[PDB]
Design a protein around this ligand. Structure first.
Ligand SMILES: *[C@H](CCCCCCCC(=O)O)C(=O)C/C=C\CCCCC
Ligand code: NA
Ligand code: NA
Ligand SMILES: [Zn+2]
Ligand SMILES: [Zn+2]
Ligand SMILES: [Zn+2]
Length: 91
């Protein structure tokens, strides 16, 4: 329930969000894991803000690939992954 945990679960997605092929099975597993673990509104907000800051800290972020993760992995993330997510209005 901290950004350390969030960046760990998402590490398998790193090559994909830097413009490489994907998302891998392991990447989709990481995001699905996070979704299952983020069961409350508070958890969803914390994970949102972690992902926004992480998106911001990734060198040469491929915006299209980053945004595509939830739909490509069939995970119901309630916002679009980018360096500029509005984490205030989830649900
Ligand atoms: C971990 C990357 C850490 C970047 C610095 C974050 C600092 C945050 C702050 O608020 O200051 C990773 O390697 C995770 C890789 C995948 C993330 C993919 C989803 C987001 C695009
Ligand atoms: Na994006
Ligand atoms: Na919004
Ligand atoms: Zn897992
Ligand atoms: Zn920060
Ligand atoms: Zn769900």
């Amino acid at each position: 329930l901290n950004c350390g945990q969030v960046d760990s679960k998402m590490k398998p997605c790193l090559t994909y969000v830097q413009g490489g092929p994907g998302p891998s099975g392991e990447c989709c597993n990481g995001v699905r894991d996070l979704h299952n673990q983020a069961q409350s509104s508070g958890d969803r907000q914390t994970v949102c803000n972690c992902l926004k800051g992480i998106a911001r800290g990734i060198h040469n972020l491929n915006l299209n690939n980053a945004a595509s993760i939830p739909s490509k992995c069939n995970v119901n993330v309630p916002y679009t992954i980018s360096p500029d997510i509005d984490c205030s209005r989830i649900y």
